[PDB]
Amino acid sequence: FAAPAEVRHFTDGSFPAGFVLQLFSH
Amino acid sequence: RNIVGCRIQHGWKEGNGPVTQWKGTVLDQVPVNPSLYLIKYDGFDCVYGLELNKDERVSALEVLPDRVATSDAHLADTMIGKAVEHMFETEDGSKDEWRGMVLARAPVMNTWFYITYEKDPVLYMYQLLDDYKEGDLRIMPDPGEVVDSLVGKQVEYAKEDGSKRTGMVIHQVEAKPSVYFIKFDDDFHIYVYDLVKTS
After folding, report:
1. Which of B7, B58, B72, B75 has fewest C-beta within 10 Å?
2. Are the beta carbons of B198 and A18 separated by less than 8 Å?
């Protein structure tokens, strides 16, 4: 398993605009 | 039949191999998905995420008696939220210093701390006051509050196949509210993410 380095999509499309979740390792 | 805080044991079936016995301590039941437990198993430094009563690799789950008990808070409270250098010893007897961050005092196991590492961004648990006294831990000097809590949202990404997979934001760190724990549906590790302003 390889975790995504960035996450910016939710299934209900509600990810806040202008932000991203970055894996702590980047 | 509430197992949070309890020692547990169960069979574990890795692939098609023979069932092995596993022992651990249930740290928490995820509020946004109550069939999901965090477990600290003896021998694994990593916190595991398992649907203990649903996962098909788990069998004969039993509550065990608690572990035999024992008997500094300022040191532990100054460590939390902080960046740290954690010194591990390579087979050569030499020293590899992993930079990481201390996220919280672990639940149930109070002597233990949630920690994550830049060279490995999953959720570990260690008894860090020992490593600090031993000198093997240095505490470095010192969006998540603007944005409402993402906890409970279901994450969605694509693999290089173009296949989309899902995960879930299960926790926001009280000490550093831009840090979030994600448990993906296809792995038992707990991955640590930072909420960053784009560009």
Report:
1. B72
2. yes
Torsion sign across C-alpha atoms B52, B53, B55, B56: positive
Pair B125, B47: CB distance under 8 Å: yes
Integer Cα distance of B55 and B36 in angstroms: 10
Distance from CA of A13 to the nearest CA of B (A): 9
Q: What's the Cα-to-Cα distance from B191 to each of B33, B69, B84, B111, B197, rounded to whole Å?
A: 16, 31, 18, 22, 19
Residue of A9, A16, A24 lying closest to B194 (CB–CB):
A24
Residue of A1, A9, A24 lying closest to B116 (CB–CB)? A24
Return the H-helix or E-strand segment holding A6: strand A6-7
Which of chain A's residues have a Cβ under 8 Å away from the Cβ of B155? 7, 9-10, 21
Task: Note whether B121 contacts A10, CB cutoff 8 Å.
Answer: no
In B159-170, which positions are buried (b, 16+ CB within 10 angstroms) versus exposed (e)?
eeeeeebebbbb
Q: Which technique was used to obtain these atomic coordinates?
A: X-ray
- What does the domain layout of chain B look like in residue ranges? 1-199
